[PDB]
Amino acid sequence: SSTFSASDFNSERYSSSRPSYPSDFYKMIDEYHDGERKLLVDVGCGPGTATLQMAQELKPFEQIIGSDLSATMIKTAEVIKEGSPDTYKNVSFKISSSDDFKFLGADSVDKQKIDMITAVECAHWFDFEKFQRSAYANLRKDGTIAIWGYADPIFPDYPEFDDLMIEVPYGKQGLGPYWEQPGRSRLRNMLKDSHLDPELFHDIQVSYFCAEDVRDKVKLHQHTKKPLLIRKQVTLVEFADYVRTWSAYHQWKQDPKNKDKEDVADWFIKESLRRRPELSTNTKIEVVWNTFYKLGKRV
Ligand SMILES: Nc1ncnc2c1ncn2[C@@H]1O[C@H](CSCC[C@H](N)C(=O)O)[C@@H](O)[C@H]1O
Ligand SMILES: COC(=O)C/C(=C\C(=O)O)C(=O)O
């Protein structure tokens, strides 16, 4: 979304308040990946969310590059890199579209060089077909493509908040109209309508996980497929700070037509307290997201 390129998009709050990804998932990715480790490119990298994690959580790469359209996001990524130089000595950031690999050099762009391409919490914004064709043109043989993301969390132990987990994001009088489409609908549906092309990728692996399954011992026991479990301990304040990082929230908050309305993130806190009056706003509780991933090896 162009929202994340706004000069005043709060990329610092994105970095502080957005979820990152668990070691078990990275271990799975490394078990999937075969072969050399010269170059990892993380497209749509944001403020280095997955990029900086991968420097530590995967086996070493000679170089890791995060690319993104947003200068705002890349600047934050660079700030974090510079804070731990190093830990991140082999990580660089580039302003580039997810299908533009010109930063590889005139002699390497579109010449099937990269070992692994990741696209994390962003591929719903892409023309998926155009993106996968570019990835194919930019991966070495049997190079990995790994796409993953998340949406629509619940609090497993607080089913009283399930209605808020609909109304906060999707209230018809609130944030609902502000989600950009079709990206939001694609994300919510776990990119189920977009497929790695079997002419371009093989050993294709797909997973889907509904966070409500955490409430059901049978469903957890019977998963066929190593789900991505994005579980976090958050206070109500921290969850509200995550709301404040949403693209839809940025747009809602800045729309002059909403100037006299109660802030939606603040409303979340107030309404949660009304539903669970024993809960303090600094008590940690578990939140879990719906997730997906798609893995392929370049043919
Ligand atoms: N076509 C495109 N090419 C590259 N980046 C894109 C893009 N469309 C959207 N983006 C970027 O997608 C990012 C989504 S938010 C950052 C997601 C981050 N990878 C994470 O794991 O949380 C934004 O920074 C936005 O600028
Ligand atoms: C980078 O985040 C997303 O693309 C999805 C999203 C929010 C979310 O589902 O947490 C948004 O702000 O657009």
Going by the DSSP 8-state scheme, the letter that residue 176 receives in this structure is: G
Domain ranges of the chain: 1-299
Pairing of strands 231-234, 201-209: unpaired
**Is residue 264 within 8 Å of 252, Cβ to Cβ?**
yes
Residue 178: nearest ligand to its CA?
Answer: 2
Residue 19: nearest ligand to its CA?
Answer: 1
d(CA 138, CA 213): 37
d(CA 147, CA 194): 11
d(CA 103, CA 180): 29
Give 257's contacts (C-beta < 8 A, 6+ positions apart): none
**Structure token pair of residue 92:** 């660089």
> Distance between terminal CA atoms of the chain?
30
**Is residue 285 within 8 Å of 158, Cβ to Cβ?**
yes
Q: Answer whether 97 contacts ligand 1 (Cβ < 6 A).
A: yes
How much distance in Å is there from the Cα of 215 to the middle of ligand 2? 24
Identify the residue whose C-alpha is closest to ligand 1 atom 5: 44
What is the widest separation between alpha-carbon atoms in the chain? 62
**Residue 111 neighbours by CB distance under 10 Å:** 14
d(CA 169, CA 154): 12
Element (H, E) at 65: strand 63-68
Q: Is 20 helix (H, G, I), strand (E, B) or coil?
A: coil
CA angle 287–292–298, rounded 5-degree value: 150
d(CA 3, CA 47): 14
Q: Answer whether 295 contacts ligand 1 (Cβ < 6 A).
A: no
List b or e across 127-148, with b for residues whose CB sees 16 or more CB atoms inside 10 angstroms: ebeebbebbbbbbbebbbbbbb
Pairing of strands 285-298, 231-234: antiparallel
Q: Is 32 helix (H, G, I), strand (E, B) or coil?
A: helix
| Atom of ligand 1 minimally distant from the CA of 18 | 22
In 3D, which of 56, 49, 52 has the Cα closest to residue 23?
Answer: 56
d(CA 207, CA 233): 24
Q: Which CATH number fits domain 1-299: 3.65.10.10, 3.30.413.10, 3.40.50.150, 3.10.20.30?
A: 3.40.50.150
How much distance in Å is there from the Cα of 246 to the middle of ligand 2? 6
Q: Answer whether 126 contacts ligand 1 (Cβ < 6 A).
A: yes
d(CA 214, CA 231): 10
